[PDB]
Design a protein around this motif. Sequence first.
Motif, PDB file in Angstrom:
ATOM      1  N   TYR A 136      21.955 -23.358  21.084  1.00  0.00           N
ATOM      2  CA  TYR A 136      21.726 -22.002  21.524  1.00  0.00           C
ATOM      3  C   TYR A 136      20.580 -22.026  22.557  1.00  0.00           C
ATOM      4  N   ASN A 137      20.903 -21.758  23.819  1.00  0.00           N
ATOM      5  CA  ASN A 137      19.965 -21.972  24.933  1.00  0.00           C
ATOM      6  C   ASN A 137      19.300 -23.356  24.813  1.00  0.00           C
ATOM      7  N   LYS A 138      17.979 -23.441  24.763  1.00  0.00           N
ATOM      8  CA  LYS A 138      17.344 -24.771  24.626  1.00  0.00           C
ATOM      9  C   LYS A 138      17.260 -25.284  23.162  1.00  0.00           C
ATOM     10  N   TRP A 139      17.597 -24.425  22.192  1.00  0.00           N
ATOM     11  CA  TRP A 139      17.396 -24.729  20.799  1.00  0.00           C
ATOM     12  C   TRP A 139      18.574 -25.554  20.275  1.00  0.00           C
TER      13      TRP A 139
END
Length: 169
Positions: A136-139
């Motif tokens: 999830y995005n950078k995660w």
Amino acid sequence: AVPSSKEELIKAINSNFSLLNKKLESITPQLAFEPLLEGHAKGTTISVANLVSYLIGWGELVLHWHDQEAKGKTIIFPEEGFKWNELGRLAQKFYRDYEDITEYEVLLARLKENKQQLVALIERFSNDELYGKPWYNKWTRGRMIQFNTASPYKNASGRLNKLQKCLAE
């Protein structure tokens, strides 16, 4: 530092959960439904049962994200109809979602079964799927799981600790 591998994620979940569960088991059931704790947003007062509902709701939501993904549906984060700055209202939803489970022991059993379903979920992924690339995005997937399992378990234990002080005064 924070968990950075599959093995550390599982350890952090089992450990935080075992400490939380000990505290939950020690609460008299007839007190578990009374508003006695500060809630998840400013000015609210919640029960122990509400707190457990919150944890189950977050765990079912993490499973729901994974179910949507398995079925090729676009995941709405954090949840359909909520923004990330509205997590206080999402907490309210979780309290209402489980407000029918009025036996404390069935509530604890549900929380335990949820935790076990989450551990089984993590077990299906490699350390690389969990921690070697963004989800999830950078995660990473691992971090997103952690944020909603191990972290709220520890936070809830801290809240219960404060309560247990009062109940010996």
